[PDB]
Design a protein around this ligand. Structure first.
Ligand SMILES: Nc1nc2c(ncn2[C@@H]2O[C@H](COP(=O)(O)OP(=O)(O)O)[C@@H](O)[C@H]2O)c(=O)[nH]1
Ligand SMILES: [Mg+2]
Length: 408
């Protein structure tokens, strides 16, 4: 009968990716500017977005512009960054979630090394989907040429396991659309062909990039931060619920550092609140029946049973911090054994099997660069694909990783 009324339009986090100078920032400006004609955005000017501010977080410095807008279908947080290094750092550290990405490819240049590398990183950090905007169409007078670039991009996407045959590719000119608005174009479809292509891009983004599942609908996960003995019935484990929800009476697992163990949550507490249910984002104390404080310790996570498992070895994309950004001047090398900060604690590990983007072996990865490598931890800990971690030496972050593949 009646659909449920949605009080808020769906939300998704996207970003523009692609090679420097291909039009990422111009496209971002053009989107906000076209959508501002509908009343759905603050029109943001190129020079504004192009001057992206620095952000600090957990020891990583990244230049990143954040714009917001909506379509008729969905609200968007949109990230855009000046340089390649910002994209590596944002994608690896996860400082900007991407539910999907707009890959901007210059028609006049075709895909370029950072085109490949941003698709690579998109695959490795688990970006679900990509929409391509083939920019600078105004510079290519030749439909046969546009097709060849589009085929090359599809082939490139397919080689990183995106569905190259399904990815929408919209060809256009971000610059011409912005000039068309400045010259008086309305933002209504059919009013201006360059603006129509921006509107076409966003329709494709609305249709093709999925809205992420709500965090509270995902399987429960909480990293244990503190634990307390208050009565004999069990220990109160505290933390912030990273995702999902937990209810009194539910069976959860304690995962990592010790054999996985099942227990019943018999209470959920927040400040001044006894709850029946803790929700993602809530800082809670959870009473864990029959668990003694000695059985439980930071590093461990609480999780819906079977939703996450302990592992010791995995492939990852790792960024090495420059000394400028608080790292060391020396490269990472095979068999280096730093600390791996996994959610709450340092775990000792050894890195190995450095794999260059072309798949050849690498002898090292210098600060400021990124590489695929294998981590083996000394103790098992709850690991899943897309989990981020810091690599740390004497408490200082010297790199950043994202799990790309569980090996054991
Ligand atoms: N001819 C043309 N130039 C464009 C177009 N989009 C961007 N540019 C120009 O290309 C340069 C790089 O664009 P920018 O958005 O800064 O690229 P980014 O580094 O990928 O963000 C700028 O001087 C833009 O004005 C386009 O559609 N056509
Ligand atoms: Mg830019």
């Amino acid at each position: 009968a009646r659909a449920k009324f949605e009080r808020t339009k769906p939300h998704a986090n996207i970003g523009t990716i692609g090679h420097v100078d291909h039009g990422k920032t111009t496209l971002t400006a053009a989107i906000t500017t076209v959508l501002a004609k509908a009343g759905m955005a603050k029109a943001r000017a190129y020079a504004d977005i192009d001057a992206a501010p620095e952000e600090k977080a957990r020891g990583i410095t990244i230049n990143t512009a954040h714009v917001e807008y909506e379509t008729g279908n969905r609200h968007y947080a949109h990230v855009d960054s000046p340089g390649h290094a910002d994209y590596v750092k944002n994608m690896i550290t996860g400082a900007a979630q991407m539910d999907g990405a707009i890959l901007v490819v210059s028609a006049a240049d075709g895909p370029m090394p950072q085109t490949r590398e941003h698709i690579l990183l998109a695959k490795q950090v688990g970006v679900p989907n990509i929409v391509v905007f083939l920019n600078k169409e105004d510079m290519v007078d030749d439909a046969e040429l546009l097709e060849l670039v589009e085929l090359e991009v599809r082939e490139l996407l397919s080689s990183y396991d995106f569905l190259g045959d399904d990815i929408p590719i919209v060809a256009g000119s971000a610059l011409q659309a912005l000039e068309a608005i400045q010259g008086g174009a309305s933002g209504q479809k059919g009013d201006n062909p360059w603006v129509d292509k921006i509107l076409k891009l966003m329709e494709e983004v609305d249709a093709y990039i999925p809205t992420p599942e709500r965090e509270v609908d995902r399987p429960f996960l909480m990293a244990v931060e503190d634990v307390f003995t208050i009565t004999g019935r069990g220990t109160v484990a505290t933390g912030r619920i990273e995702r999902g929800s937990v209810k009194v009476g539910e069976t959860i697992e304690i995962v990592g550092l010790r054999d996985t163990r099942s227990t019943t949550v018999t209470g959920v507490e927040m400040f001044q609140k006894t709850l029946d249910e803790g929700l993602a984002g809530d800082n809670v104390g959870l009473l864990l029946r029959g668990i003694q404080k000695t059985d439980i310790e930071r590093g461990m996570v609480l999780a819906k049973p079977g939703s996450i498992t302990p592992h010791t070895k995995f492939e990852s994309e790792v960024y090495v911090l420059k000394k400028e950004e608080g790292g060391r001047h020396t490269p990472f090398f095979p068999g280096y054994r730093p600390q791996f900060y996994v959610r709450t604690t340092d775990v000792t590990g050894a890195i190995s099997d450095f794999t260059a983007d072309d798949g050849s072996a690498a002898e090292m990865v210098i600060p400021g660069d990124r590489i695929k490598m294998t981590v083996e931890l000394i103790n098992p800990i709850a690991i899943e694909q897309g989990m981020r971690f810091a690599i740390r030496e004497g408490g200082r972050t010297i790199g950043a990783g994202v799990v790309s593949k569980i090996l054991q």
